[PDB]
Enzyme design. Structure first.
Site, PDB file in Angstrom:
ATOM      1  N   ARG A  40      85.902  72.658  10.573  1.00  0.00           N
ATOM      2  CA  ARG A  40      85.862  73.403  11.829  1.00  0.00           C
ATOM      3  C   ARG A  40      86.381  74.823  11.646  1.00  0.00           C
ATOM      4  NH1 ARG A  40      90.061  71.241  14.049  1.00  0.00           N
ATOM      5  NH2 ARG A  40      90.463  69.478  12.632  1.00  0.00           N
ATOM      6  N   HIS A  97      91.540  74.390   5.954  1.00  0.00           N
ATOM      7  CA  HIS A  97      92.119  73.608   7.039  1.00  0.00           C
ATOM      8  C   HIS A  97      91.247  72.405   7.411  1.00  0.00           C
ATOM      9  CE1 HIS A  97      92.966  72.334  11.159  1.00  0.00           C
ATOM     10  NE2 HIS A  97      94.221  72.520  10.792  1.00  0.00           N
ATOM     11  N   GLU A 114      88.862  63.223  10.842  1.00  0.00           N
ATOM     12  CA  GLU A 114      89.985  62.593  11.534  1.00  0.00           C
ATOM     13  C   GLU A 114      89.633  62.013  12.902  1.00  0.00           C
ATOM     14  OE1 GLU A 114      93.269  65.129  12.257  1.00  0.00           O
ATOM     15  OE2 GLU A 114      94.623  63.510  12.873  1.00  0.00           O
ATOM     16  N   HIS A 165     100.900  64.959   2.321  1.00  0.00           N
ATOM     17  CA  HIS A 165     100.461  65.795   3.431  1.00  0.00           C
ATOM     18  C   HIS A 165     101.561  66.022   4.459  1.00  0.00           C
ATOM     19  CE1 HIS A 165      97.393  67.651   5.947  1.00  0.00           C
ATOM     20  NE2 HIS A 165      97.812  66.926   6.967  1.00  0.00           N
ATOM     21  N   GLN A 170     106.243  70.758  12.419  1.00  0.00           N
ATOM     22  CA  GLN A 170     105.966  69.760  13.446  1.00  0.00           C
ATOM     23  C   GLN A 170     107.107  68.764  13.648  1.00  0.00           C
ATOM     24  OE1 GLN A 170     101.920  68.212  13.100  1.00  0.00           O
ATOM     25  NE2 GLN A 170     101.058  70.288  13.014  1.00  0.00           N
ATOM     26  N   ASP A 196     102.638  63.979   7.548  1.00  0.00           N
ATOM     27  CA  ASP A 196     101.812  64.820   8.430  1.00  0.00           C
ATOM     28  C   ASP A 196     102.553  65.521   9.582  1.00  0.00           C
ATOM     29  OD1 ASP A 196      99.599  66.125   9.461  1.00  0.00           O
ATOM     30  OD2 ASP A 196      98.566  64.286  10.079  1.00  0.00           O
ATOM     31  N   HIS A 252      93.045  62.231   5.946  1.00  0.00           N
ATOM     32  CA  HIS A 252      92.557  61.333   7.003  1.00  0.00           C
ATOM     33  C   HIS A 252      91.280  60.599   6.589  1.00  0.00           C
ATOM     34  CE1 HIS A 252      95.680  63.192   9.321  1.00  0.00           C
ATOM     35  NE2 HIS A 252      95.034  64.341   9.424  1.00  0.00           N
ATOM     36  N   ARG A 310      97.266  69.065  20.698  1.00  0.00           N
ATOM     37  CA  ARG A 310      97.129  70.268  19.884  1.00  0.00           C
ATOM     38  C   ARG A 310      97.589  71.507  20.641  1.00  0.00           C
ATOM     39  NH1 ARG A 310      91.684  72.831  17.047  1.00  0.00           N
ATOM     40  NH2 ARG A 310      91.398  73.631  19.182  1.00  0.00           N
ATOM     41  N   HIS A 365     103.041  69.056   7.596  1.00  0.00           N
ATOM     42  CA  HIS A 365     103.169  70.368   8.257  1.00  0.00           C
ATOM     43  C   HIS A 365     104.601  70.425   8.774  1.00  0.00           C
ATOM     44  CE1 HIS A 365      98.863  70.022   8.091  1.00  0.00           C
ATOM     45  NE2 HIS A 365      98.856  69.085   9.020  1.00  0.00           N
ATOM     46  N   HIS A 406      91.530  68.727   5.750  1.00  0.00           N
ATOM     47  CA  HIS A 406      91.487  67.685   6.783  1.00  0.00           C
ATOM     48  C   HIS A 406      90.012  67.366   7.010  1.00  0.00           C
ATOM     49  CE1 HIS A 406      95.241  69.670   8.709  1.00  0.00           C
ATOM     50  NE2 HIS A 406      95.627  68.415   8.546  1.00  0.00           N
TER      51      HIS A 406
END
Ligand SMILES: N=C(N)N[C@@H](CCC(=O)O)C(=O)O
Ligand SMILES: [Zn+2]
Length: 450
Positions: free
Chosen positions: A208, A205, A234, A55, A60, A319, A268, A81, A57, A231
């Site tokens: 949500r 994603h 988490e 995992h 980041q 991550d 997670h 976030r 991204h 995800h």
């Protein structure tokens, strides 16, 4: 080509004087213990299968460590976030690619030989699609090839700002596709990824960010050969919000509405109650544990002991990339269990009391499964992805077999990883990557721009 290891961790366990034959295409062709090293390159220390990183991204990494500033008495994942959204709003295609290349080089140096890139930065700064909507996905693949790291690209379906299909926020504009555009992107990526020797996966994603109808639509679309990542659970807030939306917990909801199986990686999965843990283990899905990021974000501690006890499968991911360290993830996976239970030696098997070996075995298997790649094991027919530890290190030189993994994972560190091979190609030698100088120069320039 041929290489020779005085000590190597094979699927059946530790072996000595192992001669490996590697095909022109980087596949393990022959593996012979108790052999002679005649004509083979003698390796400088203990050999292990490379660790998949399940995992990531990539972008980041550019902000890693910069969010450690109190801006509120109760800073949390959600204020973090916003900071992440601010950076992603300014990232050009060129910057994204530079960051990814640098990150992948650093991953390789740590012993991560393949990565699942959970990729949701799709569109331009205005949230409009590039002339070829795969623009940024293709750059991730090019970066992975430049670094030499294995890659499963997971383009991410992202459509909403919250449960019940809330409208996407402006800060999320670069992420957004409907199911149809997503499926078109997914299908269009198959050819270029295949050409690069890279893999593909389906990805939502989070619960949500998509709707149940979208999940059904995508899963019914016929891409049955692909891993599926999401995800889930988490943060406590997602659990509460999911309950208010559906009367179910996140993992509970997923398992009641979707046929979760071995294709799945549940990233997670932190807030899993006993029933949810049991369901995960029964299903054969892989828990994608991102220990350094979960700690950094204040997510909580996964019930890893209960999970492992019931045959659970897991792997590790870096991550947000505050840490790029196989050692740190596995070490603190175990240490978090110890801090919670106030006991030692938490993650072991009935047939394996050694903690380091238990962790390494588990994460290799879960990582390979989650990536959908023929890796995680030094077996004929699997890809030649491996690391070579420091044979001159006194802790490692004095240890044998599983004790060596304990010395490394619990008393040692990243610099004990010396050489790294992916697909039969040396990509790190004596701690150095051939592309590191050029990449670091490009990268420092990008950091300055940002
Ligand atoms: N959850 C973590 N750690 N990362 C997320 C933050 C965004 C969100 O979850 O909505 C992400 O990178 O997409
Ligand atoms: Zn993530």
């Amino acid at each position: 080509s041929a290489i020779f290891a005085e000590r190597a961790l094979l699927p059946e366990g530790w072996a000595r004087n192992v001669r490996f034959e590697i095909s022109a295409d980087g596949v393990l062709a022959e593996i012979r213990p108790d052999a002679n090293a005649d004509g083979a390159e003698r390796l400088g220390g203990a050999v292990l299968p490379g660790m998949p990183n399940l995992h990531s991204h990539a972008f980041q990494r550019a902000m890693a460590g910069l969010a450690e500033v109190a801006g509120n008495p109760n800073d949390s994942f959600w204020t973090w976030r916003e900071l992440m959204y601010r950076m992603v709003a300014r990232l050009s295609p060129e910057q994204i690619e530079v960051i990814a290349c640098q990150l992948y080089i650093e991953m390789l140096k740590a012993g991560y030989t393949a990565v699942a890139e959970f990729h949701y930065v799709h569109h331009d700064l205005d949230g409009r699609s590039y002339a070829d909507p795969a623009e940024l996905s293709l750059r991730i693949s090019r970066a992975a090839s430049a670094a030499g790291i294995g890659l499963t690209l997971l383009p991410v379906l992202y459509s909403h700002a919250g449960f019940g299909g809330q409208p996407a926020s402006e800060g999320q504009r670069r992420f957004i596709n409907g199911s149809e555009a997503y499926l078109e992107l997914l299908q269009r990526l198959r050819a270029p990824l295949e050409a690069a020797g890279h893999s593909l996966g389906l990805c939502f994603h989070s619960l949500r960010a998509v709707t149940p109808q979208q999940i059904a639509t995508v899963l019914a679309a016929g891409h049955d050969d692909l891993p599926v990542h999401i995800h889930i659970a988490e943060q406590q807030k997602e659990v509460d919000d999911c309950q208010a939306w559906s009367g179910r917990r996140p993992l509970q909801w997923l398992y009641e509405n979707v046929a979760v199986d071995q294709r799945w990686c549940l990233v997670h999965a932190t807030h899993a109650d006993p029933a949810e843990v049991a369901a995960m283990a029964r299903s054969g899905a892989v828990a994608g544990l991102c220990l350094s990021t979960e700690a950094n974000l204040g997510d909580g501690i996964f019930p890893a002991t209960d999970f492992l006890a019931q045959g659970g499968r897991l792997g590790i991911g870096s991550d947000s990339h505050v840490s790029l360290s196989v050692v740190e993830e596995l070490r603190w996976l175990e240490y978090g269990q110890r801090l919670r239970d106030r006991k030692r030696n938490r993650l072991y098997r009935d047939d394996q009391p050694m903690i380091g070996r238990t962790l390494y075995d588990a994460a290799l298997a879960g990582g390979a499964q989650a990536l959908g790649q023929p890796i995680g094991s030094l077996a004929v027919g699997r890809r030649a992805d491996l690391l070579v530890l420091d044979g001159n290190d006194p802790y490692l030189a004095s240890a044998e077999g599983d004790a060596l993994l304990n010395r490394w994972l619990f008393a040692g560190g990243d610099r004990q990883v010396r050489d790294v091979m992916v697909a039969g190609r040396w990509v790190v030698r004596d701690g150095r990557h051939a592309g590191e100088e050029r990449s670091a120069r490009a990268f420092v320039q990008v950091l300055g721009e940002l």
